[PDB]
């Protein structure tokens, strides 16, 4: 259990989790706010 959390902390796994979260986030942002060349809220 402790060893498994350790394995899940290793560089490639933490990287896939981190960038997968980041990708879902950016995808959803471009889903609710698509296109957009500018920051329109000023």
């Amino acid at each position: 259990m402790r060893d498994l959390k350790t394995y899940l902390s290793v560089a490639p796994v933490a990287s896939t989790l981190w960038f997968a979260a980041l990708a879902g986030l950016l995808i959803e942002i471009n889903r609710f706010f698509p296109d957009a060349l500018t920051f329109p809220f000023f």
Binding site: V10, A11, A14, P34, A36, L37, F39, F42
Partner: protein, 154 residues
Amino acid sequence: DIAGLTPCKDSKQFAKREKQSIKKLESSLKLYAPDSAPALAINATIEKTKRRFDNYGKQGLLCGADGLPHLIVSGDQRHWGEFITPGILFLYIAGWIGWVGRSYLIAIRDDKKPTQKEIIIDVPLATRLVFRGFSWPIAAYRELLNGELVAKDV
């Protein structure tokens, strides 16, 4: 307007592009039964197209003779949304990331085996440190003044 451009709300070429795009998607739409799912998808792309061109027209983008938005990065206050404002947002996020990573490296540097935490992340420490990036500009400014930002005689 600026640089000889014209607002995209006033550009014939811009409206011609919106027209030709929409008619193109409708040419694809004529092939499918209007109740079908490909039809609903092409309708969604059409609505998204209208939203796109209408938003570019609204927010004041200038167009070239090509009928396409051109960005004014000179700093002209009418166009800060095109670079300066997203640029400040970027610098905030990038400064956040780098400040947090630097905080982690400083935190593990006196460990008995530093490289050990560079290949296997100390996630509790990382979670403790991620939100320091929220105030990274004050922290880094204070470090610059205090002399903790730059290593001495390097």
